Amino acid sequence: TGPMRVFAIGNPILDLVAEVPSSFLDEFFLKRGDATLATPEQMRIYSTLDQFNPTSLPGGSALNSVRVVQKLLRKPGSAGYMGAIGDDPRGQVLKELCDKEGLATRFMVAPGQSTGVCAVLINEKERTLCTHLGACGSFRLPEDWTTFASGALIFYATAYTLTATPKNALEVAGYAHGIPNAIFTLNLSAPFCVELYKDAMQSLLLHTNILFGNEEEFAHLAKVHNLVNKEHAVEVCTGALRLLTAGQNTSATKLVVMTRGHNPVIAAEQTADGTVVVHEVGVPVVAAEKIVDTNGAGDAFVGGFLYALSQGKTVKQCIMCGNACAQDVIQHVGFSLSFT
Ligand SMILES: Nc1ncnc2c1ncn2[C@@H]1O[C@H](COP(=O)(O)OP(=O)(O)CP(=O)(O)O)[C@@H](O)[C@H]1O
Numbered sequence: 001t002g003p004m005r006v007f008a009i010g011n012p013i014l015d016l017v018a019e020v021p022s023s024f025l026d027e028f029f030l031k032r033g034d035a036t037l038a039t040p041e042q043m044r045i046y047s048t049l050d051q052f053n054p055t056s057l058p059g060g061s062a063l064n065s066v067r068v069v070q071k072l073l074r075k076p077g078s079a080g081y082m083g084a085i086g087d088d089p090r091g092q093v094l095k096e097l098c099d100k101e102g103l104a105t106r107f108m109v110a111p112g113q114s115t116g117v118c119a120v121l122i123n124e125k126e127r128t129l130c131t132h133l134g135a136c137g138s139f140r141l142p143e144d145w146t147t148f149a150s151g152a153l154i155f156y157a158t159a160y161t162l163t164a165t166p167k168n169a170l171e172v173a174g175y176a177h178g179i180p181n182a183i184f185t186l187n188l189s190a191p192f193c194v195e196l197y198k199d200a201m202q203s204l205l206l207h208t209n210i211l212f213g214n215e216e217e218f219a220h221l222a223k224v225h226n227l228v229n230k231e232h233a234v235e236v237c238t239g240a241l242r243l244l245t246a247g248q249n250t251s252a253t254k255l256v257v258m259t260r261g262h263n264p265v266i267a268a269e270q271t272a273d274g275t276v277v278v279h280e281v282g283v284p285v286v287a288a289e290k291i292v293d294t295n296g297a298g299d300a301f302v303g304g305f306l307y308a309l310s311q312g313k314t315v316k317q318c319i320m321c322g323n324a325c326a327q328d329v330i331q332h333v334g335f336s337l338s339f340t
């Protein structure tokens with residue numbers, strides 16, 4: 001019943017989580033602590049994982065971010081999500097897990113493909129990930145998605161979605177553009193996304209209100225689009241903001257947010273008269289010994305940010321909520337929704 005406050009598209013994944021012996025990594029020629037895409041010989045891993053009684057969980061970057069929004073808003077159908085699943089058991093499991101959490105979802109079924117799946121192999125205090133994207137690459141947004149997302153003002157896509165087709169994110173952004181007060185938000189997601197999709201990002205960014213990325217992703221954006229330590233981060237955020245604004249003034253949100261690990265978050269926002277406002281928000285310290293790993297930290301950040309944005313909070317408050325959510329997630333094995 002909602003109301004739906006955030007709608008996202010993404011590449012939905014089922015995570016299969018197990019503590020495993022080091023021999024299992026060796027069996028599949030995995031390097032401890034690396035995140036990779038499954039090779040053909042590694043496809044057998046998902047079934048062979050059953051010996052460990054793995055736990056199935058939702059995953060994928062955008063999915064995890066909207067699970068944060070849903071957890072924090074609590075009411076059923078507070079966040080919505082679309083992406084593609086396969087025709088196999090794991091897609092049915094994924095749907096059930098999302099329904100239990102109260103997310104509104106519509107998964108496109110891709111016949112003949114398998115659901116995206118990630119073997120999450122815990123061993124020696126490290127997280128080793130082996131992902132098969134599968135059906136995720138087949139997603140094509142249904143034309144009635146705007147009815148599914150009716151009433152939402154915040155729209156999100158990861159740049160991972162460009163792999164299926166840039167059309168999906170472009171259609172979400174284009175719809176948002178036509179709705180005064182709607183916000184379209186985008187994650188740079190990974191260096192490969194920045195490097196492969198320069199043209200599609202050029203168009204999408206002109207339709208983007210809030211751009212999220214980490215330090216490495218922004219370094220690549222700066223190189224690919226010739227944008228040219230904290231001062232440098234301010235320069236890059238400021239440069240990136242021309243990709244959203246075309247150097248013109250407009251009365252919509254135009255904001256660039258760069259996460260920076262343990263260092264302060266930096267953001268640049270353009271106002272209606274062209275002033276560039278620089279935000280700097282320190283990250284409350286989390287002790288080294290408390291951190292499990294930082295996998296998924298940016299997904300948690302975005303989820304907290306978008307939750308706070310849905311509540312009408314200031315930019316600094318949105319960044320602070322993002323930081324709080326990321327703080328909790330990095331102290332847990334996996335993408336915990338237990339917030340503190
Ligand atoms: N060591 C640390 N201490 C405190 N907060 C941290 C942290 N590392 C990351 N964070 C939190 O996570 C948010 C997102 O950080 P960032 O985008 O750099 O993570 P990431 O997605 O690059 C992690 P990884 O490299 O492990 O995938 C930060 O803004 C901060 O709030």
Ligand SMILES: [Cl-]
Nearest residue numbers: 010011061062
């Ligand atoms: Cl995603």
Ligand code: NA
Nearest residue numbers: 329332333334
């Ligand atoms: Na974690």
